[PDB]
Amino acid sequence: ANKPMQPITSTANKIVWSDPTRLSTTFSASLLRQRVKVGIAELNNVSGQYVSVYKRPAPKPEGCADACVIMPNENQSIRTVISGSAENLATLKAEWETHKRNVDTLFASGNAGLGFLDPTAAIVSSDTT
Amino acid sequence: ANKPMQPITSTANKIVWSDPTRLSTTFSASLLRQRVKVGIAELNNVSGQYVSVYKRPAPKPEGCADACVIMPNENQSIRTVISGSAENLATLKAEWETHKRNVDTLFASGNAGLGFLDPTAAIVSSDTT
Amino acid sequence: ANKPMQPITSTANKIVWSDPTRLSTTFSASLLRQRVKVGIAELNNVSGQYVSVYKRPAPKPEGCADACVIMPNENQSIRTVISGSAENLATLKAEWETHKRNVDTLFASGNAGLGFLDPTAAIVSSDTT
Amino acid sequence: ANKPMQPITSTANKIVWSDPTRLSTTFSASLLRQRVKVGIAELNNVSGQYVSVYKRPAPKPEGCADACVIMPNENQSIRTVISGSAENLATLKAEWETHKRNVDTLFASGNAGLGFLDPTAAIVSSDTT
Amino acid sequence: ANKPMQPITSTANKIVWSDPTRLSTTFSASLLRQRVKVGIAELNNVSGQYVSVYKRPAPKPEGCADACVIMPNENQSIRTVISGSAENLATLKAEWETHKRNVDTLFASGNAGLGFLDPTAAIVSSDTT
Amino acid sequence: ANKPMQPITSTANKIVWSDPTRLSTTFSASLLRQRVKVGIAELNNVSGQYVSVYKRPAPKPEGCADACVIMPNENQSIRTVISGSAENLATLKAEWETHKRNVDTLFASGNAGLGFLDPTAAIVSSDTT
């Protein structure tokens, strides 16, 4: 099905995968750690930055067509940042799920891609009733 | 199930939701529309920034006490940036799903949330055959 | 039959639609609400402005060229302004119909589209006997 | 059934029809011709401006039901501007039809004339499926 | 029974409902948010402002009993300001009920509307016995 | 059931009540009488102002503390202004009732007390059929 990608670059801080069949397609994950003190407690805050980059050509316009014309590619980027204390990861996972579902409601099932924000979208919190 | 929110700030470019039961837990989406001149083609680029913020109290020591003691609050934040051409929204949604899967197989499934990122993760691309 | 479009910007006074398949073909409606006093009485005046814009390429000579590179394209704009008191809306609608009729008998049927007048054209009023 | 008007004023660009029985209602057409270049060719642009004007008395008090009472007349004005090259007249007429239907959807059928909009309107494009 | 109004002007801060049949009557709500500190804790203050406006003609001469006679409309305005922390909403609602009862005692029942004050009125507190 | 209070300051234009058991919880009514010309006629305009003030402590965490020290306390204020001609008081009373209804369906029932608007609220007018 989907092409597996292998780590081009490996580091204690950064790892990057790419498609061997298409070196432009990349998926990069980074982690950054801090020793954070709140109140009296000590927590291990971590910021996970995940970037998905794809290189896609422009659609086919009209004026000189054959089966032998290419359009210059355009960048498609998706960046996700997850910041939170490692000590409280169980709730963070559920909040990630809620974030995914809200983004799907706005975008994957709405005209957010077009550029219109629907104030009537059903946006729900992480906390269940 | 999940408690719905309602808009607090409305704009043609930004809408912010908040939980009536618990304030300070917000889900703000901002959209930006541009006119990117690809090399030979004119494309309408849409940049969407999705932010979800939760204030979670810090965990208390085991068997600490009753609610007579209140802990400081964490900052569980999720930021997602979707950038792409409006023309290729059909492919962009698939890229978004693959981004979900790749992030899940490290953060949700794996231990990336604790700072342990695994080079052996089963990363997949958006190209499916 | 006819492909619908989606709104991109919605306010309390202006809404913009555009074709997802082919952007730059827009239909925007704008309203201005004013309080106008006529005689002893005072009426609410509504000024509706509607703009239809289609971006169109230059006319194509028959069999002249194939279908990739975009030639320069022209604007094709229609602008309609409706002014009247909401207290007197039915007559305004009737006059809108008669305006359609006159514009059609000059432009749709006659040679006004090319830029030719016709003093012999059969113009009709909203008043009916 | 409608009372025809006759041209009060005749000019190479301006013609004004007015009702002999009621000179307060007029329909005037104005065309401005222009020569424009679209790079590959020179086109003849025309901008037809169509104005429908009617002087209408303010609505009577409900149940007044007499000819004795008279009130000052408001202005009901409809201004239409058609622009585009004469070469593309055939498709410009179709765009005119689509514009007519959209304006009917908002104003005629809908309650857009009263001073408020509906983003859920069913707007359609000029280009068919 | 009562005529419903619909939001003519919408904003995250301001919303205005007006009667489509009679645009002279409006109900407008405005909310101002504020963060206030009472030393021990931080509270979210909200100051809801609500305005009811109606244009009403002056009373007819006694026994006139015709639709022919009309007179200019006066202003009937009711402004309500609700202030208080969102935390104490439960008791603020009871305070609202008590305020309603007191205003009914003075104005609705007594001659407060005509300009007559009664110090002997039976005012009641928010706190029950 | 509900404890009454006593007036403390009575004039011909302003009366102040306060709870003997717990003062600073006051209810003051003030009136302004003006002579306003409308059309040929002249009407007596009455401007009634009613203020309900409750001095309330900060929200109390459950079982947090026993019973001496006054923590800092917040204000809970309600201000109602009634404007209209005494010559037309009957309609003003019904409009007051409808104002109650709208304020209740936003604040008492809806989430307006927290800072959440609702364009979908069932706002109704005094005009009844």
From TrEMBL, chains A, B, C, D, E, F:
List UniProt keywords, sorted A-Z. Answer: Capsid protein, Virion
**Start and end of every AP205 coat protein domain?**
15-129
Entry keyword annotation includes Transmembrane: no
Query: What's this protein's name?
Result: Coat protein
Query: Pfam families given for it?
Result: AP205_coat
Q: Which GO terms describe its cellular component?
A: viral capsid
Q: Which domain of life is it from?
A: Viruses
Alphabetical list of InterPro entries matching this protein: AP205_coat (IPR054038)
Key word Protease present: no
